[PDB]
Design a protein around this ligand. Structure first.
Ligand SMILES: *C(=N)[C@H](C[C@@H]1CCNC1=O)NC(=O)[C@@H]1[C@@H]2[C@H](CN1C(=O)[C@@H](NC(=O)C(F)(F)F)C(C)(C)C)C2(C)C
Ligand SMILES: *C(=N)[C@H](C[C@@H]1CCNC1=O)NC(=O)[C@@H]1[C@@H]2[C@H](CN1C(=O)[C@@H](NC(=O)C(F)(F)F)C(C)(C)C)C2(C)C
Lengths: 305, 305
């Protein structure tokens, strides 16, 4: 028993991190087979940090302008190209530590692990959710660009995020094909994140985790309808709940014998009256960065290798 | 910027996890050079799960009773011995993935990462603190025994924890020499954790992290004395603050220009009046599982390789 913000083991990804230097800019890259992936703004110098034309900047470079290091070994760049906002650097050596992988684009509300890196070197791992406004609430310092987000399925690493920029306290990036999450661009403009909402299906999953772990004080006997719940969710900046979400919560409903709509009636009460000085799983706020699948995984015990 | 419960990258430890089966009991072991370390209660069968004599149980075993698997490869046991509460299994092959390591015993209030494993297979990584009552608030299911806790110093893995048992919602274990943290034994008796307290130096470190990240609302102009603070800390089940703690907080005081005793005056107010519906770094409770060193590491950017 117990419940923790749990990240995926990072070993399979640590073996792919490299350092990429171009000019006076150093950041992180992802080395899979004979391609190094990294943010394209590594080719930016401070004259262009505000309104760059990346096609122009790339044509003025040659392979020898790119310093790529895997620890201490140097990798020789034999070709470069741009795919949207990422740079793909072809190198002379296929990474022997390349895991089975795929590139997936995730949806708001889904969670992943982040391997924060500096100078090609892994620094720490943490779990986070893609927010409904397409930012993540990460922890990133200067030089963290190119750090990646990932999930693990059995033996397969799904890469879903590469870090590009911080926007007033929160973080924005692309999928691994170089397409940004959200309406952001990789230059200095007046862009801000839009209004964030609370991920309702995740809050419900977390309440089920609490019941599984013995926190029952917030339950009640009343139920409610999808439409009467969503009426109250809207007033509190909670995402509306769909039939798809109810079905997703099925396994947790089955394991605890509490109906989804029953649990929604508890959530309704918590939103109207607050916690009144009680905590749930050691939190005094309603937590929305665990998916139904995170809860099953942690309250059932799925491993990977 | 940002602040997350961040764990160490786990790659160096994932390579040491093996599965150990004896009888119908399977759990995890740690394979370093040609020794596999695992909890000694793997030699327990349900007749002895309550009052075992481990010396007797061990003498009735031979090397062939121990099934050790590193993924799919089998390791041949060529010797066994007991050190306090751990079993040391000598095997015929030195682990080629053995990192530079040491065995350290940590103190209450210190943090470490836990690699939760099942059947020798890594499942997830999370960060936690050793509580003042010598338990940890972990997340562990059946079969997690032998999972280890660790820190990383530059290139060196310090192993500090091996998981043995759950006691009413919290978790207890040994250092890697087999000596239990706290007054617990590896059998079924009527043992419970003692009263827990809040780790004050860690709360102060977390308040400095908040200031570094722009949360300033709780500051005030008043200061206080060590003895007047500790007078109020006692009433709230907070650990007393020493001059050693003040010195440890020096770097954070320097970086924010707020004196430790100044920050204590803010903590004093928060304890007497509560948060009054405000949050700090996304929490509505005072967080005590970040050390001063965790905060520096995350708000300065130290890596490892
Ligand atoms: C990559 N190495 C850094 C890491 C950033 C900064 C601290 N934490 C992070 O996540 N990223 C950058 O330097 C990117 C890069 C130019 C500027 N930039 C920023 O992150 C800046 N933000 C913005 O561009 C803004 F404000 F418009 F959102 C900064 C002010 C330094 C936070 C480019 C090409 C966007
Ligand atoms: C190791 N594989 C498990 C993992 C435990 C149980 C679920 N979460 C964990 O951390 N550990 C055990 O099976 C140990 C082992 C016998 C019983 N035990 C327990 O954890 C039990 N607790 C106690 O002994 C108690 F209550 F006294 F504290 C259990 C009731 C199953 C939680 C031995 C040798 C202590």
């Amino acid at each position: 028993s117990g419940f923790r913000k749990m990240a995926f083991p990072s070993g399979k990804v640590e073996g792919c991190m490299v350092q990429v230097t171009c000019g006076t800019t150093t950041l992180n890259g992802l080395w899979l087979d004979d391609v190094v992936y990294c943010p394209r703004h590594v080719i930016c110098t401070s004259e262009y940090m505000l309104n760059p034309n990346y096609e122009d900047l790339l044509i003025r470079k040659s392979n020898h302008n790119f310093l790529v290091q895997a620890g201490n070994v140097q990798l020789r760049v034999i070709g470069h190209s741009m795919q949207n906002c990422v740079l793909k650097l072809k190198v002379d050596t296929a990474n022997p530590k390349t895991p089975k992988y795929k590139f997936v684009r995730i949806q708001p509300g889904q969670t992943f692990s982040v391997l924060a890196c500096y100078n090609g070197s892994p620094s720490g791992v943490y779990q986070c959710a893609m927010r409904p406004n397409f930012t993540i609430k990460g922890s990133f310092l200067n030089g963290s660009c190119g750090s990646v987000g990932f999930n693990i399925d059995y033996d397969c690493v799904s890469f879903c995020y590469m870090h590009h920029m911080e926007l007033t306290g929160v973080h924005a990036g692309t999928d691994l094909e170089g397409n940004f999450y959200g309406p952001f661009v990789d230059r200095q403009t007046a862009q801000a994140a839009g209004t964030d909402t609370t991920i309702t299906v995740n809050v419900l999953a977390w309440l089920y985790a609490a019941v599984i772990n013995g926190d029952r004080w917030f339950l009640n006997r009343f139920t409610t309808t999808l439409n009467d719940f969503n009426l109250v969710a809207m007033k509190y900046n909670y995402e509306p709940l769909t039939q798809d979400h109810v079905d997703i919560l099925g396994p947790l409903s089955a394991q605890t014998g509490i109906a989804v709509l029953d649990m929604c009636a508890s959530l309704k009460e918590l939103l109207q009256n607050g916690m009144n000085g009680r905590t749930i799983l050691g939190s005094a706020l309603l937590e929305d960065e665990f998916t139904p699948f995170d809860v099953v995984r942690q309250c059932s015990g799925v491993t990977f290798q």
